[PDB]
Amino acid sequence: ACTKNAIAQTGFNKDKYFNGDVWYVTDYLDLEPDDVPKRYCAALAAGTASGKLKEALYHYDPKTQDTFYDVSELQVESLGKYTANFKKVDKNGNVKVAVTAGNYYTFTVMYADDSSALIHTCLHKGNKDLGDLYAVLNRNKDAAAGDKVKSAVSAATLEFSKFISTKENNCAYDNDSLKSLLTK
Numbered sequence: 001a002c003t004k005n006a007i008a009q010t011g012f013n014k015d016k017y018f019n020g021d022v023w024y025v026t027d028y029l030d031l032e033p034d035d036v037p038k039r040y041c042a043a044l045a046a047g048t049a050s051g052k053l054k055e056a057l058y059h060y061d062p063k064t065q066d067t068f069y070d071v072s073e074l075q076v077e078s079l080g081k082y083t084a085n086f087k088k089v090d091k092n093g094n095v096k097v098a099v100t101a102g103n104y105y106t107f108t109v110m111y112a113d114d115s116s117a118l119i120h121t122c123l124h125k126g127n128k129d130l131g132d133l134y135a136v137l138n139r140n141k142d143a144a145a146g147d148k149v150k151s152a153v154s155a156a157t158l159e160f161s162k163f164i165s166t167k168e169n170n171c172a173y174d175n176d177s178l179k180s181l182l183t184k
């Protein structure tokens, strides 16, 4: 279960974050880890599409090869905090699993600037038992986390040394499909 009410970044600039570009997860903190794919890759695009706030997600287990994309319509709870009802899609946006109540994640942007961000998310999917996930994002997939986002981790009363890096996983991304998915 999720336990954190994440605080959104003061002064969060939604138009800069939701600019239709791609964000790569470089480091993440699963508060309730299992015997985890401690090998994971994830990336997302976030943007406004025909007036609608959207996110496209990509997940890839580099060991199992399990792959999936998602498109979501975001609803605003407050500045920097969103509820997203996701649908699973192929890379072209064809629906594989339709939007369904009970399938949603919340997402809070705790810190962001033009190159980096820290987010909190809470996934709800069916009768899955899921917990809080924090993720350090960068505009460049190979960027080591800088002082601004690591300080924000600390300000969140989290330890960055506990975050798991994805950089060792040899991830490759279809950033083109993520951007085009924003419109689907």
Ligand SMILES: [C-]#N
Pocket (backbone or CB within 6 Å): 123, 133
């Ligand atoms: C993925 N939570």
